Amino acid sequence: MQIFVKTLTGKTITLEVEPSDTIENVKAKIQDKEGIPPDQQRLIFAGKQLEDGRTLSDYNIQKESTLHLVLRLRGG
């Protein structure tokens, strides 16, 4: 299933993931798409942020899920 990640700048990013995969896999994709590390990369679904220590299905991440990428605390 492909999900769309809309960043704060309204930037949609299509990522090919599965309901069995883990958030860590979804985040990695965004890296090869935009180029943001897991330290500044943040996910938003169901009105709450997701963690790398969980599965997509855990957050009820269905197909064409409308994800939201947010910038995490950064040095500068």
Partner: protein, 38 residues
Amino acid sequence: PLCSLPEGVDQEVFKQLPVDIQEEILSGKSREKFQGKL
């Protein structure tokens, strides 16, 4: 409080995000993509 938004910010995405993210961007922190406009 969406009076102070970053550059190229998406209102739709802003009002769509949780209060946690709305307060993080409002504080003027977490800026890696672009450089803050101080």
